[PDB]
Amino acid sequence: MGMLQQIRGPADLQHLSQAQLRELAAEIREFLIHKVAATGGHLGPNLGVVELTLALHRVFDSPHDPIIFDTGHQAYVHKMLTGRSQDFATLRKKGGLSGYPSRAESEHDWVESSHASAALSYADGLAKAFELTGHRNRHVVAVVGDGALTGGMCWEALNNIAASRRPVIIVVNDNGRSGGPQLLFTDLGLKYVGPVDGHDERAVEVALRSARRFGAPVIVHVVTRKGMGYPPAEPGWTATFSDALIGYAQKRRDIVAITAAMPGPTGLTAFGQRFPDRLFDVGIAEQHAMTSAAGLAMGGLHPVVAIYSTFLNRAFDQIMMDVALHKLPVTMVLDRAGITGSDGASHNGMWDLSMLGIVPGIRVAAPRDATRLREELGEALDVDDGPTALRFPKGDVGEDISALERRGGVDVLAAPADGLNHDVLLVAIGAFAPMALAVAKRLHNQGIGVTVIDPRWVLPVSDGVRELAVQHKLLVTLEDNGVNGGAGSAVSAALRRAEIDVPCRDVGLPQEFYEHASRSEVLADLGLTDQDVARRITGWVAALG
Amino acid sequence: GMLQQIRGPADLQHLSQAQLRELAAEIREFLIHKVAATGGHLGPNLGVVELTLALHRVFDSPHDPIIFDTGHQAYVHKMLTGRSQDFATLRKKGGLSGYPSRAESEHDWVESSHASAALSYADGLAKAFELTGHRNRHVVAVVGDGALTGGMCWEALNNIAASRRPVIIVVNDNGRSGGGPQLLFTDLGLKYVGPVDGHDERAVEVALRSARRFGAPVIVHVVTRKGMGYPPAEPGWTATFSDALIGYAQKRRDIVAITAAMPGPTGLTAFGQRFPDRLFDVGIAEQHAMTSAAGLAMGGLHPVVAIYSTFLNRAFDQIMMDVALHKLPVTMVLDRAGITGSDGASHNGMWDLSMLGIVPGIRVAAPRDATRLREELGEALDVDDGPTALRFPKGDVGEDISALERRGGVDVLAAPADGLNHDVLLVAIGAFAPMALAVAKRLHNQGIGVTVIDPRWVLPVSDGVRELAVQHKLLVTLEDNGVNGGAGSAVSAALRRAEIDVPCRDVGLPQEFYEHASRSEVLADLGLTDQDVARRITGWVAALG
Ligand SMILES: Cc1ncc(C[n+]2csc(CCOP(=O)(O)OP(=O)(O)O)c2C)c(N)n1
Ligand SMILES: Cc1ncc(C[n+]2csc(CCOP(=O)(O)OP(=O)(O)O)c2C)c(N)n1
Ligand SMILES: [Mg+2]
Ligand SMILES: [Mg+2]
C-alpha cells in the first residue's frame, strides 16, 4: 500500500498521473478486501465506488464543496482519502472508526444517519444556507445510490432543487444496471450527464467537471459494479420468521409479503421462491410499502410488511392514516428490533414500541423465542379488523422458554418459590425473557419472590397483567426499547387507568442515540444486565414504604 | 332541475353535451349555496366539476375505483353518487363527511385527508385485483398538482411503471394558468396524455377514454382553475405566532421559516413579505421540510418549520435521524394542535406530544395563551443544541392567564385557598388552562385544594412538576392530545424515574379516531368539560382521602 500510505488528504491526489490513480485504486481494493468482512461489511458497495470516490476528491474541494453520501455505508474510500486509512483496524468496534460518516471524526463528514434517500434534502438545505450566509462558490455534491433514488424524499428534494440555480450536483451511483428506479430521470427538467462508466476514473472526472461548470443543478449518472475487482463480493430469528410465514401462506392464498428493497435480509426471498406472485419489493419506499399494503387489504388480502424496526419510523403516518384509520388487516414484521449495536445510533430498533403505541386499535407482539414467534405470527394473521405488528431482534434465537401456565394470554415463566411472597411482577418484553429469568433468580437469592411474565401481546396491555399486578408490591417492565412511551410506560398507564397504583418502574433503553458497539457492550454500558437490574430492583423493594 | 334526477353515475350516460353544460352550472350554484365560504374547500370542488362529470362518464365506479388524493375535492363525486340531498348536514356531527367515507358509499375508498397517498392505494388495489382475478378493474387516482409534489407519488409511480396493471394517474393541475411540481412528468417512462383543458368536459372524456383503452398505466394531465365560476374563490393563535416570529426575525438574520405548501394558513405569508429570501415553501413535502431544515441548521441557521400537528406524522423519521441525531437547532411550530373537530379523524392534532416524546433530547412547549406563545417561541429560538417544538390549537386566543408565581420553569395559575389542603396538582397542558382553572374553582367550592400549573415546557418534564408533585396527594394531567404516550404518561414516567409514586391520572383524548363534529362537541362527548373533569377528580380524591 506504498502510495495509499502517502495520501494525507484529498489534495495529495491532485497531481497524480492517471497511471498513479490506477495503482492507488488497486491498493484501495487490496486494503478494503483485507480490512472489511467479506459478508455483512458493505465490502461490495465500497469496492463499487473506488474510482467514483477518487474522481469526487479530484474535482471537488471538500469540505468547501460538501460531499454528502446518501446512506453512508459506502463512505469507506472517502474515509481512506480523508486521513483515516490507519483507523480501519478498529472499524465498527466500540471507540473505533464508525461504519458511517461522523462529524466528530472529520470536517469532511456531514451526515451520520444511515436512513437512505435523505442526502438531496440535506444538500438543498445546505445550498440555501450558503446563499443566505453569502459563502461564494460552495458546490454541494450528493452521492445517491440507485436504491436510495427509489425513495420519495429524493423526489421532494429534486423538485425543490430544480426551482433554483443554487449548485447542487446529484451524482447517481447506479449499480442496479450494467434495484433502481423504473422511472426515467433523463428528462425531468434537470440537466442530465451520462450514463458514465463509474470504473473509468477519468470519465467520471470529465462528467463531474461539466457538472461543476454548468452553474446550476445537474444529475451525473454513473454506473458501478457492486464488489468490482473481488469475485466473491461480485438458528436465526429471521429464518424462524421465513419458515413460519411460508407455512401459513401454504394454507392461505390471501397472505402477501412486502419488503422495502430487503427481500434477503427480511427472510422473504424464500417466500418469493414458493409464491413469486405474492412477494412485492417496492424499492427503498417504506411509505409506499405500508400504503400499498392498505390498498392490498382494501382488495381483500392480508399483507405481511417486513421492515426493520428503525426504518418503520418512515411509515408512521401511513400506519396511522392509511392502515389503522381504515381498520385494515396488515401485519408488520419488525426484524432488528432492540439494540443492534455495531451500526450505531440510526440502526438500533429502539423506537417501535413507543411509535406503535400511538396507533389507535393496534395489537403488537414481541416474541420471546422461536415457538412464540410462530404462535404470535399465526395470531396476527387471524386478526382481520386492524393492524398487527411483531418485533424481534437481530441474530440467533436461543432455546424455547416454557411457560408454567397461561393466564388471559399472559405466559407465567417463573413464580415465587414456596416460602417466598409475590413481591415483584417482572414483565419481560420479547427478547429480554432470558435476562428477566436471571434477574428473578438473583432476587430469589435475596428472599425476594418474583413472578416473571411474557405478555406476548404487549399492546394493548392485557387483563392478565392487570390481574397479576394487584397480587404484587412492585411492577418492573424490562424492554429492549426506549423508555419514553415504551412498554413500561404503557403498563403503568394501563394500571393507573384501572385505578391500580402499585409502584411501576420502566427498565429499558434511555431515550438517547448510542455510539456503535456490540449489542452486549451497549447493554452492559447501560446497566441492562441481570446483575445491574437485580441490584436496582433490590433497592426498589428495600425502599417500599 | 337536472341534478335532482341524477340517482348515480349511469344517469349521466345518455346526457347531451348541452345537458352536461346545464348540469355543470347547476352543480356550481349548488356548491356555492351549500358550502361554507371559509374552510369548506369550495374552490377545489368548483375546479373539478367537468373533471368529475368526465370521470363518471368514462369509468364504471366502483368496478373502476375512483380514488381522490386528499379527498377535499370529492363533493361533486358525492353529488353524482346519491348524496346531493345530504349537503344540508355537510361537516356537521352525524352529517355528511367533508371527505370520502366507506360507510357512506360503495363509491368511496380512502377517508384519509393526508395528501399524496392515492397512487400508493391504487398500486395495492390493482395488485389485489390481479391476485384475486377480478377482470378489467381500472384504478383511477385523481392527484392534485400539490399532492404530486409529495414523495409518496414518486414511490408509487416507480412501482406502477413496473407493471401493465391499469392504473390511470389523473393529474388535476390548478398550479399553472404555482404550487405544483417543478419537475417534468411528460417523460418518466409512463404514457402521457395532455395537457387537457379541464373545463372542456368533452376533451377530458376523450383523454380519459384514451387512457382507459391503453392497456397499461397512463398519466392524464388536466389543467383546471381553482374556484372556476366563483370569482371570490379564483385566526388569533396563528396571527400571534406570525407577529411573534416576525418580531424575533427582525433582530436575528439567522431565523428562516419553512412551510409544506401552507404559507397563508401557518401565518408565514406575512414573514415572507418582510423577509422574502428567508421563507421556503417546499410543496406538500413535510419530509423534505424537516431534512432541508437540518441542512440549513448545518449551514449555521435556525429554521422555524411551521407544519400542522397531524401532518408532522409524515416527518417523524426526519425529526429523529436528520435533526435530533445531529443535535441541530430546528424549531417546529405545530398549529391545529389538539381537537380541530369538523375535518374528522385525520385532521385532529392529537398525536404530536406522543410522537415528539420519542425524540432524544427534544424540548416541547404548549402555550396556554398569546403571551406564553411569544415567550416560549423566544425560548425555543435560544435553544442552539437540539430540536424544539411549540404546539397550539386552531382558532382564536382568549385573554392572557396570569401566573401567581414561576417555580422551576412552571407557572402556578392557582393555589389552594388559605385553609384548604394540597389535595390535587392539576397539570394543565397548553390550551386546557381555562378548563383546569374552572375545575379548580368547582373543587374549591367542594373544599378540595388544587394547585393548577402550566409547565410551559411539557417535555422534558421539569424539576418544577417533580417538586410540586411530592406536596400533593394526587396528580392529574389534563391534555388536548391522545393519552397513549402523552403528557400525562410522560409526567408519570418522570415521577417514577425520580422514585415519586404519588398517584397520577392521565386525563386527555382516548387513543381513538374521532368522527367529524365541532371541537366543543368532541370534547363534550369525551367528558373533557370542567364539570365532567371536576367530577372524576372528586371520585379520585374520595378514594385516596
Ligand atoms: C430508509 C432505509 N431503508 C432501508 C435501508 C437499507 N439499505 C441500505 S443500502 C440498500 C439497498 C441499496 O441501496 P443503494 O442506494 O443502491 O446502495 P448500494 O447499491 O451502493 O449499496 C438498502 C435497502 C436504509 N439504509 N434506509
Ligand atoms: C400531508 C399533507 N400535508 C398538507 C395537507 C394540506 N393541503 C390540502 S390541499 C393542499 C394544497 C393543494 O393541493 P392539491 O393537491 O393541488 O389540491 P387542490 O389544488 O385541488 O386543492 C394542502 C397543502 C394535506 N392534506 N396533507
Ligand atoms: Mg445500488
Ligand atoms: Mg392544485
Author numbering:
A (entry chain BBB): 27 to 204, 223 to 278, 304 to 614
B (entry chain AAA): 28 to 204, 222 to 278, 304 to 614
Sentences from the paper on this structure:
1-Deoxy-d-xylulose 5-phosphate synthase (DXPS) catalyzes the first reaction of the MEP pathway and is an attractive target for the development of new antibiotics. DXPS catalyzes the ThDP-dependent decarboxylation of pyruvate and subsequent carboligation with d-glyceraldehyde-3-phosphate (D-GAP), the second substrate, following a preferred-order, random-sequential reaction mechanism. Here, we have applied our previously reported truncation approach and removed a disordered internal loop, to successfully crystallize the DXPS from an important anti-infective target, namely M. tuberculosis. Following the truncation approach, we were able to obtain protein crystals and report herein the first pathogenic DXPS structures: a holo structure with bound ThDP and a structure containing the enamine reaction intermediate.
The asymmetric unit of ΔMtDXPS contains a homodimer with each subunit consisting of three distinct domains and a ThDP molecule. Domain I (res 1–312) and Domain II (res 313–483) contribute to the active site, where ThDP is bound. Domain III (res 484–638) makes extensive contacts at the dimer interface. Overall, the structure and domain arrangement of MtDXPS show high similarity to the known structures of E. coli and D. radiodurans DXPS that were described in detail by S. Xiang et al. with a Cα-RMSD of 1.390 and 1.207 Å, respectively. Three seemingly important differences, however, could be identified near the active site of MtDXPS: Lys473, His426 and Ser112. His426 is conserved in all bacterial DXPS but adopts a different conformation in the MtDXPS structure. Unlike most bacteria, M. tuberculosis has a serine at position 112 instead of a glycine or alanine. The serine at this position creates a steric restriction that prevents His426 from adopting its previously reported conformation, while at the same time enabling the coordination of a water molecule that stabilizes His426 in its new position. The water is highly coordinated, making hydrogen bonds with His426, Ser112, Tyr98 and other water molecules. This network extends to the aminopyrimidine N4’ and the backbone and side chains of Ser425.
